[PDB]
Structure 1
Amino acid sequence: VDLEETGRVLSIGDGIARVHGLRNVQAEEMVEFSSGLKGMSLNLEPDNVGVVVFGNDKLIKEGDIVKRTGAIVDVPVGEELLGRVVDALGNAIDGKGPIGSKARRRVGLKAPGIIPRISVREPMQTGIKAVDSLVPIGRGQRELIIGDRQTGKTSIAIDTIINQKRFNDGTDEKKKLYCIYVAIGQKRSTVAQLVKRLTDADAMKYTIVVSATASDAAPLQYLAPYSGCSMGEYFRDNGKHALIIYDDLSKQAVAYRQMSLLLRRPPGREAYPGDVFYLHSRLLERAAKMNDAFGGGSLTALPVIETQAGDVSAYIPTNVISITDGQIFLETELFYKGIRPAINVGLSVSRVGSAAQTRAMKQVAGTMKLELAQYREVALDAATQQLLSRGVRLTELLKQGQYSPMAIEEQVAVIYAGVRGYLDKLEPSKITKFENAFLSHVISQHQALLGKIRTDGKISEESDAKLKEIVTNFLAGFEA
């Protein structure tokens, strides 16, 4: 009898249900189906309304009841989501009770304008030697993690998440960082392990995992990164700090292409829709750094992009590159050789975040960026053969194992070891043995020195000479 706050389905086909009814329903309003399935008014045409279905559209029979909800599409946000695994609508799929969410956000917010903002100043610490030294990220910034399949893209995000323990278990509140991992199109098996691993590092507690996995309906994957983005805005908008990881945007774009093509929209480069750039630009603007006028909170974004055969000048890689504030390029070759993290230090860049680098690091860091520089072409007389030796060593230093973020000073320590060239007469096979011993050593005994380098935020003249003695004797102690 009702035709205004209600409809029954005309046709349910290529993943668009055309509904009849719902007169008052608005653009982008979450409607609801008999099944319990939710959908989205997208098409407001004279006779019919086009609904995108957020689930399995087998359940959608012809002529099913469809109620409005007057809610523009939105997800649950708030502190309550930490520790939980949820689908892209916010429902909990982790079987741990329900989520006592109290607030809600439109998944479709606009991004902070020119004004409510301000230059990225504070560090976002991956705890990964190579990133933190040569491609420093800063809270509020967007850094693209982009490489071929199986090059370590995800590992990087995972470590970065694991690292934030040391700040959240800390006393200082401006250093705390809340974590949001969005799984777009990945194996469910993988999310699950990912989650357990996070749980063993006691990192799950400060983390939201949003999963729209490979078997989930396309719009779910199309939706998720935005759902998640909202969840993480809440922290940016109440003067807190969040980090969101989109893994990966390449698969989301794919999902979006399904929807586009199925709705008969016009294909272009690689059959993507014309608006597949907007799709990403508007998700990734929603991360930035607020001026103190709005709580100086920040959303930082690490979106992932999967290149095919190292082609970082396809359509989708250049789109996203042209959005983000730089990228960490991972190289299948390097990975193979054993250089892992397989970062192309020469190709990888961070723009904004240059100035969010801790000072302690900057000293020793800058002088690595430089010697690695003069290594890259020179890759014979005393000095050029020297510049090599020094190089192959600095390189070995930046190899780092999975699941072991380093404290920024622990980093500045083991890097110091190489930039002052104590590593030079060691054969390189042995460099990583040395590193692991040397680091775990200063960590055990010299908690003094470490604690101090963090504090003076700098390698003090004393610190330095102290450190000199440690390393100098330790590398006599190096028998082979």
Structure 2
Amino acid sequence: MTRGRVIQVMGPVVDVKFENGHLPAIYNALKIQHKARNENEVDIDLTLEVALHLGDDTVRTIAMASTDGLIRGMEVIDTGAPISVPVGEVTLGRVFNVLGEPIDLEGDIPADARRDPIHRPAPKFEELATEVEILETGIKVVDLLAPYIKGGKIGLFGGAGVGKTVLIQELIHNIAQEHGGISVFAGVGERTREGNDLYHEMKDSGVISKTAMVFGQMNEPPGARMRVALTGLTMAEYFRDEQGQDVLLFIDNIFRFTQAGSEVSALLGRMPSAVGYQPTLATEMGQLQERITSTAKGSITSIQAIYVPADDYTDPAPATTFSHLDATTNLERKLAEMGIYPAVDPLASTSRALAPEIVGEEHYQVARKVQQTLQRYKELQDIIAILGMDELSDEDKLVVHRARRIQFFLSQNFHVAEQFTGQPGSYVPVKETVRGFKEILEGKYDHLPEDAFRLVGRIEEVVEKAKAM
């Protein structure tokens, strides 16, 4: 019988001994449920993830909650499978932890629901997508300068105060509006008050009825925080495989995933590699981020905030993530204080997709001309500072008068900001934003005032904001 017995407890690391031949496989789940039989003992409900096999019929596990109260000799139940997480329609709108249990006060998921394993091999070479398709977000500065890929990894380098959560809520809204795509948020090791703030903002937004959240936050043991992105991703994989649709998957601060695995590996007793990282850095990051691919039936695209420790891109925890990134969207504070929403930096946001083979020729020429005019206008700032606005030339004065129109045209009215500014917001397709930036760059909309270009959706409705003023 698969009943176990605890031998060693030392912090999160718990050694459990079974009988011979009845060992649990690696990565399985172990339910410890103990009702205290006297006043000495303490009630325990605690799950363990098998990590090693030590010999002498024993098993070394890592813990998902606190190990206080675990007695040498108490009973451990083998589940027979890894951590089974509920997926389906019953996860939409619900806040979950790493064990697939609802954090919310709304209710419990019944036992007959479908639960699929947490650890799964990546989708095979036979099953992937041959071509590279574009992911149409409806944000102009994303769909023009740093375009996304179905099955991509995108990096957010904003921080606080630049509207990162506003982009998150609008990407959920736009993909679930136009593409029919469920989103999944997964806060890997984030502040609990910021998790509650994000949940109340997505409840006020109304975007939540379409997303699913997973919070394994900072108070939990490292064995929880290493497995939280996997249980957001397992919720996304149901809608990729069974439903077949374009799913988002937000992993907030995946540096918390890397250092959570690092401290798990330090607890397990492994020799630390370069820069204190777990020897298995690149393969744990690979076992996360090779399940974020586009298969033949659907896709999972991912937007991932990245910490950038001691702000160098050569530290191994940024360096093994940047080898999976397909795009970056830098959020800059001086564009949010200027009044351009979203605050996406147009010159630092890069994309692997922005190429004429993937996207197209006209989009590429318009996007590179936009980057050239904004680069020239960024060069001209000191010249305007020391020489004044006049007496530059005719050509670079036309460059400034063109590029400030382009710079303010990059802002949209989001559907998220409707409860804040009252403006209904817009989804702008990629063909109309290429046509709009092309018609601005030709000089056709040059005579209009520049405050008509702020917070406007497309190019057919900048004429009405110029007409109202």
Matching residue of 1:93: 103
CA-CA distance at 1:12 after TM superposition: 1.2
Query: 1:246, 1:273 → 2: CA distance?
Result: 20
Query: 1:155, 1:346 → 2: CA distance?
Result: 20
Opposite residue 389 of structure 1, the aligned amino acid is H
Inter-CA distance 415–119: structure 2 relative to 1 (3 Å threshold): same
CA-CA distance at 1:43 after TM superposition: 1.5
**Residues 141, 301 of structure 1: 8 Å contact kept:** yes
Does 1:129 find its partner at 2:140? yes
CA-CA distance at 1:61 after TM superposition: 3.2
Does 1:287 find its partner at 2:284? no
Query: 2:462, 2:188 → 1: CA distance?
Result: 45
CA-CA distance at 1:418 after TM superposition: 4.1
Inter-CA distance 329–97: structure 2 relative to 1 (3 Å threshold): same
**Residues 361, 408 of structure 1: 8 Å contact kept:** no
Q: What secondary structure, in the 3-state scheme, does the structure 1 residue paired with 2:187 have?
A: strand
Opposite residue 46 of structure 2, the aligned amino acid is L
Opposite residue 171 of structure 2, the aligned amino acid is T
Q: Which deviates the most, 347-356 or 98-107?
A: 347-356
Query: 2:314, 2:412 → 1: CA distance?
Result: 28
- Aligned counterpart for 2:241 among listed residues 225, 237, 241: 237
Matching residue of 2:259: 254
Opposite residue 475 of structure 1, the aligned amino acid is A
- Aligned counterpart for 1:204 among listed residues 208, 211, 214: 208
How does 1:402-421 map onto structure 2 within 5 Å?
A: 403-404=416-417, 406-409=426-429, 412=433, 415=437, 418-421=440-443
Inter-CA distance 121–20: structure 2 relative to 1 (3 Å threshold): closer
Q: What secondary structure, in the 3-state scheme, does the structure 2 residue paired with 1:435 have?
A: coil
Matching residue of 1:381: 393
Q: What secondary structure, in the 3-state scheme, does the structure 1 residue paired with 2:55 have?
A: coil
Query: 1:142, 1:424 → 2: CA distance?
Result: 37
Matching residue of 1:14: 11
Inter-CA distance 118–342: structure 2 relative to 1 (3 Å threshold): same
| Runs (5+) with no aligned partner, structure 1 | 168-174, 440-449, 451-463
Inter-CA distance 317–138: structure 2 relative to 1 (3 Å threshold): same
Inter-CA distance 314–331: structure 2 relative to 1 (3 Å threshold): farther
**Residues 414, 435 of structure 1: 8 Å contact kept:** no
Does 1:52 find its partner at 2:53? no
**Residues 120, 141 of structure 1: 8 Å contact kept:** no
Q: Which deviates the most, 230-239 or 19-28?
A: 19-28
Inter-CA distance 338–298: structure 2 relative to 1 (3 Å threshold): same
TM-score when normalising by structure 2 = 0.81
**Residues 253, 307 of structure 2: 8 Å contact kept:** yes
CA-CA distance at 1:269 after TM superposition: 3.5
Does 1:41 find its partner at 2:32? no
- Aligned counterpart for 2:232 among listed residues 210, 228, 231: 228
Query: 1:182, 1:260 → 2: CA distance?
Result: 22
Query: 1:259, 1:278 → 2: CA distance?
Result: 15
Matching residue of 2:404: 392
Q: What secondary structure, in the 3-state scheme, does the structure 1 residue paired with 2:330 have?
A: strand
CA-CA distance at 1:368 after TM superposition: 2.9
Q: What secondary structure, in the 3-state scheme, does the structure 2 residue paired with 1:191 have?
A: helix
Inter-CA distance 432–120: structure 2 relative to 1 (3 Å threshold): farther
Q: Please give the per-residue CA displacement for 1:125-169, whole angstroms capped at 9, x wherever unaligned.
A: 4333211221111322222223455544444323211323422xx
Q: Which deviates the most, 365-374 or 244-253?
A: 365-374
Q: What secondary structure, in the 3-state scheme, does the structure 2 residue paired with 1:96 have?
A: coil
Inter-CA distance 311–331: structure 2 relative to 1 (3 Å threshold): farther
Query: 2:373, 2:153 → 1: CA distance?
Result: 27
Q: What secondary structure, in the 3-state scheme, does the structure 2 residue paired with 1:57 have?
A: coil
Q: Which deviates the most, 107-116 or 96-105?
A: 96-105
Opposite residue 241 of structure 1, the aligned amino acid is D
CA-CA distance at 1:5 after TM superposition: 1.5
How does 1:325-344 map onto structure 2 within 5 Å?
A: 325-331=326-332, 341-344=342-345
How does 1:317-328 map onto structure 2 within 5 Å?
A: 317-328=318-329
**Residues 253, 304 of structure 2: 8 Å contact kept:** yes
**Residues 138, 357 of structure 1: 8 Å contact kept:** no
Matching residue of 1:141: 152
Q: What secondary structure, in the 3-state scheme, does the structure 2 residue paired with 1:227 have?
A: helix
Matching residue of 1:313: 314
CA-CA distance at 1:419 after TM superposition: 3.6
Percent of residue pairs bearing the same amino acid type: 24
Does 1:371 find its partner at 2:381? no
TM-score when normalising by structure 1 = 0.80
Query: 2:275, 2:159 → 1: CA distance?
Result: 18
Query: 1:385, 1:43 → 2: CA distance?
Result: 68
Query: 2:191, 2:97 → 1: CA distance?
Result: 14
**Residues 330, 344 of structure 1: 8 Å contact kept:** yes
Opposite residue 99 of structure 2, the aligned amino acid is L
Inter-CA distance 474–287: structure 2 relative to 1 (3 Å threshold): closer
Does 1:275 find its partner at 2:280? yes
| Runs (5+) with no aligned partner, structure 2 | 34-43, 382-391, 418-424
Q: Please give the per-residue CA displacement for 1:359-378, whole angstroms capped at 9, x wherever unaligned.
A: 99778656534533554555
Inter-CA distance 432–233: structure 2 relative to 1 (3 Å threshold): farther
Does 1:187 find its partner at 2:191? yes
CA-CA distance at 1:64 after TM superposition: 2.1
Q: What secondary structure, in the 3-state scheme, does the structure 2 residue paired with 1:323 have?
A: coil
CA-CA distance at 1:179 after TM superposition: 0.5
- Aligned counterpart for 2:454 among listed residues 416, 435, 439: 435
Inter-CA distance 474–181: structure 2 relative to 1 (3 Å threshold): closer
**Residues 147, 327 of structure 2: 8 Å contact kept:** no
Query: 1:473, 1:433 → 2: CA distance?
Result: 8
**Residues 119, 289 of structure 1: 8 Å contact kept:** no
**Residues 137, 356 of structure 1: 8 Å contact kept:** no
Inter-CA distance 383–86: structure 2 relative to 1 (3 Å threshold): same
Matching residue of 2:37: none
**Residues 7, 72 of structure 2: 8 Å contact kept:** yes
Q: What secondary structure, in the 3-state scheme, does the structure 2 residue paired with 1:38 have?
A: strand
Inter-CA distance 55–16: structure 2 relative to 1 (3 Å threshold): same
Matching residue of 1:166: 177
**Residues 125, 160 of structure 1: 8 Å contact kept:** no
Give RMSD over aligned pairs.
3.2
Query: 1:275, 1:305 → 2: CA distance?
Result: 19
**Residues 86, 94 of structure 1: 8 Å contact kept:** yes
Matching residue of 2:388: none
CA-CA distance at 1:184 after TM superposition: 1.2
Query: 1:60, 1:69 → 2: CA distance?
Result: 19
